[PDB]
C-alpha cells in the first residue's frame, strides 16, 4: 500500500493472509469456512492466516488453517485479468471473534464517488522495494468508469472498477493482490492489477465483486 497508513492491529477483522512459506497474497473471510481472493493468487499448498497484523511475529490472535480447496472462476483470463476471482475453502472452520470476522457480500453495486477501504501488506514504494510487516490501509473513492477506461484504453471490462486518485501517489499494486475493497460495510472489490504503482493517471483496478455474488453463493453451497 503506497500513500496510506497503519490500520491498527485487528481493525480489519476480515483480512486474510495467504501463505506459502511466505506471505504472497491477501484475501477476505466471507464465512467461517470460505475466503475470496484473486484468481492470479492461485497456488498449491496454501495456508490461510487469520487475525494477523504483523505477519513476521506471532502476536497471539492468529489462526493458521490449511486450505482444503481452491476454485478459480471458470472464465478467468490470465492475460486480460478478466474475472480475476477465486474461492478458497478452509480445512477447518475459523473461530469467529472480535479480531476474526466475516465481511458481507453486496446486495448491490457501489456507485462512483463512494469511499472505500483498501487494506493489505504489500509494497509501499512507487519506485523501489519496501515491504511492510504490518497491515496497511488506504481510503479511496471509486472513480467513474470514464476516468477508469481512459487510463487503460481497451483494457477495462464490466467486471472491473477503478479506485483512487488520478494524480497518483496513493495506490495498491503489489501492495496486496487479492486484498479486500470494502465500501459501506460490503465487499465490493478485490485488488487485481494496475500499471506501475500509484502513477499519475494510473489508478488501481479491482475485481467488481457485485457481478459475482450469484456465482459465489452457488459455488460455496455446492462445495
Ligand atoms: Ca502475526
Closest listed residue to residue 212, CA positions, set 87, 116, 113? 87
Residues in contact with 211: Cβ distance below 8 Å, sequence separation at least 6, in sequence order: 109, 158, 159
CATH of 1-12+103-210, one of 2.40.110.10, 2.40.10.10, 3.30.300.30, 3.40.50.2300: 2.40.10.10
What's the 9 CA to ligand 1 centre distance in angstroms? 10
| In this structure, CATH architecture of domain 13-102+211-223 | Beta Barrel (2.40)
- What residues form the annotated binding site for substrate? 171-172, 174-175, 177
1-12+103-210 and 13-102+211-223, same CATH topology: yes
What's the 191 CA to ligand 1 centre distance in angstroms? 22
Give the residue numbers marked as catalytic.
40, 84, 177
- What residues form the annotated binding site? 52, 54, 57, 62, 171-172, 174-175, 177
Q: How far apart are CA 36 and CA 70, in angstroms?
A: 10
Resolution in Å equals 1.8
Q: How far apart are CA 166 and CA 172, in angstroms?
A: 13
Domain segments of the chain: what residues?
1-12+103-210, 13-102+211-223
Which string of DSSP letters, residue by residue, matches 81-118? TBT--EEEEESS-----SSS---BPPSSPPPTT-EEEE
CB 143 within 8 A of CB 152: no
What's the 217 CA to ligand 1 centre distance in angstroms? 30
Q: How far apart are CA 65 and CA 141, in angstroms?
A: 33
Q: In what order do the strands lie in the sheet with 204-208?
A: 5-6, 136-141, 115-120, 180-183, 186-193, 204-208, 160-163
Amino acid at each position: 500500500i503506497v500513500g496510506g497508513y497503519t490500520c491498527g492491529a485487528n481493525t480489519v477483522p476480515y483480512q486474510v493472509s495467504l501463505n506459502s512459506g511466505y506471505h504472497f497474497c491477501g484475501g477476505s473471510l466471507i464465512n467461517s469456512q470460505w475466503v475470496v481472493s484473486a484468481a492470479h493468487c492461485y497456488k498449491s499448498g496454501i495456508q490461510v492466516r487469520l487475525g494477523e497484523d504483523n505477519i513476521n511475529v506471532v502476536e497471539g490472535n492468529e489462526q493458521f488453517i490449511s486450505a482444503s480447496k481452491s476454485i478459480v472462476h471458470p472464465s478467468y483470463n490470465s492475460n486480460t485479468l478478466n474475472n480475476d476471482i477465486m474461492l478458497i475453502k478452509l480445512k477447518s472452520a475459523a473461530s469467529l471473534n472480535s479480531r476474526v470476522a466475516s465481511i458481507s457480500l453486496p446486495t448491490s453495486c457501489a456507485s462512483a464517488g463512494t469511499q472505500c477501504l483498501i487494506s493489505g501488506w504489500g509494497n509501499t514504494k512507487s519506485s523501489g522495494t519496501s515491504y511492510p510487516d504490518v497491515l496497511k490501509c488506504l481510503k479511496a473513492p471509486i472513480l467513474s468508469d470514464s476516468s477508469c477506461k481512459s487510463a487503460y484504453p481497451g483494457q477495462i471490462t464490466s467486471n472491473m472498477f477503478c479506485a483512487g486518485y488520478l494524480e497518483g501517489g496513493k495506490d495498491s499494486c503489489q501492495g496486496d493482490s487479492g486484498g479486500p475493497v470494502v465500501c459501506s460495510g460490503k465487499l465490493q472489490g478485490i485488488v487485481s492489477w494496475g500499471s506501475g504503482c500509484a502513477q499519475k493517471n494510473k489508478p488501481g483496478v479491482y475485481t467488481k465483486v457485485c457481478n459475482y455474488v450469484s456465482w459465489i453463493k452457488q459455488t460455496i453451497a455446492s462445495n
